Amino acid sequence: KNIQVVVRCRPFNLAERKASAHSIVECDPVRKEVSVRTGSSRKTYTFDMVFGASTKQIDVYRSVVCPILDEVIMGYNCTIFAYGQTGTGKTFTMEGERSPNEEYTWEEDPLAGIIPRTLHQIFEKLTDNGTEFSVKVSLLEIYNEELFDLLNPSERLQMFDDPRNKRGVIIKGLEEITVHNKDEVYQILEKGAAKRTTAATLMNAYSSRSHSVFSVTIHMKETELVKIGKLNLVDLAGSENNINQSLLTLGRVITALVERTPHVPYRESKLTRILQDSLGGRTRTSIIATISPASLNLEETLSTLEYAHRAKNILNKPE
Numbered sequence: 001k002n003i004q005v006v007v008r009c010r011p012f013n014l015a016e017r018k019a020s021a022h023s024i025v026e027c028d029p030v031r032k033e034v035s036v037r038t039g040s041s042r043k044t045y046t047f048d049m050v051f052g053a054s055t056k057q058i059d060v061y062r063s064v065v066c067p068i069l070d071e072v073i074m075g076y077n078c079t080i081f082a083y084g085q086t087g088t089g090k091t092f093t094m095e096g097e098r099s100p101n102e103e104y105t106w107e108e109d110p111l112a113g114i115i116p117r118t119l120h121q122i123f124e125k126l127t128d129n130g131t132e133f134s135v136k137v138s139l140l141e142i143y144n145e146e147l148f149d150l151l152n153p154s155e156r157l158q159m160f161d162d163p164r165n166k167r168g169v170i171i172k173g174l175e176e177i178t179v180h181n182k183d184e185v186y187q188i189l190e191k192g193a194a195k196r197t198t199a200a201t202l203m204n205a206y207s208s209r210s211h212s213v214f215s216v217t218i219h220m221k222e223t224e225l226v227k228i229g230k231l232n233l234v235d236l237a238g239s240e241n242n243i244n245q246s247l248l249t250l251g252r253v254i255t256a257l258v259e260r261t262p263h264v265p266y267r268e269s270k271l272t273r274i275l276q277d278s279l280g281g282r283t284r285t286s287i288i289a290t291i292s293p294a295s296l297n298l299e300e301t302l303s304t305l306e307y308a309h310r311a312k313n314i315l316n317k318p319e
């Protein structure tokens with residue numbers, strides 16, 4: 001199956017209003033098109049889905065992620081990437097935010113993004129639909145070609161080949177935490193958030209240059225036939241950017257794949273080793289390309305759109 005590629009455009013922000021920018025992006029969800037005025041000259045792209053600035057978190061989840069979670073629960077591996085310019089909505093999309101003033105429970109918060117909703121829906125979907133299951137999660141960051149375990153309450157992780165799968169790696173020392181119930185989900189996410197703000201203190205431009213890999217693995221057993229599904233939820237460093245080796249190598253890998261070049265340089269960065277199987281392997285993969293509507297960003301926005309559109313022709317073969 002081909003990589004699914006969707007675009008999410010966010011509303012104008014006030015920094016763009018202060019820069020005197022005008023709108024140059026038109027999202028057409030019905031036609032699945034994004035049009036960019038390139039000076040009345042225009043460039044249109046077609047994607048698998050297009051989400052405009054009024055799209056709600058829950059819309060993204062139902063339209064993009066629900067199909068993918070169903071595949072995981074069938075026992076496949078899946079990956080969703082968020083790709084795009086700093087400030088355009090990668091983290092808002094993958095993680096979301098809490099609404100102000102303690103107004104919602106985490107499970108009901110309309111600003112939750114893909115990660116919290118996915119973990120909540122795992123428990124809704126598998127609970128007492130006949131199923132015995134366990135769920136574990138891990139969260140690592142990649143910064144400056146170094147691995148950081150956001151769930152380790154203490155360091156630096158070591159990468160080993162997976163002798164069982166050539167397109168795979170094993171991260172020794174990664175905290176893979178069992179999530180026993182919905183209430184545990186929020187405690188674990190809270191714990192990763194605290195670990196990331198202190199990650200913020202000891203880093204240079206850390207969040208915009210770091211990659212974040214959240215992984216959930218579901219062990220499922222029914223009578224006695226077993227299923228193991230994995231989902232990786234990846235928030236990439238900003239696309240405008242050892243500090244950039246992984247982002248740059250991701251660009252070479254995608255290029256190598258789109259040109260059918262026989263040498264794909266997967267092993268030239270930690271990110272591309274981790275998601276080697278997501279890029280031309282046996283994992284089903286979607287990319288959410290995030291963009292700004294503002295004229296200020298024409299060059300980054302065109303770069304993001306070209307990058308993402310080319311990705312549509314990469315074929316994966318799940319299982």
Ligand SMILES: Nc1ncnc2c1ncn2[C@@H]1O[C@H](COP(=O)(O)OP(=O)(O)O)[C@@H](O)[C@H]1O
Nearest residue numbers: 009010011085086087088089090091092093097
């Ligand atoms: N679709 C959207 N609607 C409203 N606010 C958004 C949207 N996307 C991003 N934002 C806000 O814009 C700011 C930057 O988004 P963020 O997701 O942190 O960007 P990135 O991770 O790409 O740098 C944040 O305050 C975020 O809440």
Ligand SMILES: CC(=O)/N=C1/NN(C(C)=O)[C@](C)(c2ccccc2)S1
Nearest residue numbers: 095096097098106112115116189190
């Ligand atoms: C890796 C990741 O996604 N981490 C998260 N931490 N959150 C905390 C601590 O509120 C997020 C923002 C959230 C938002 C709404 C509902 C529940 C969780 S998501």
Ligand SMILES: [Mg+2]
Nearest residue numbers: 090091092207
């Ligand atoms: Mg971010």
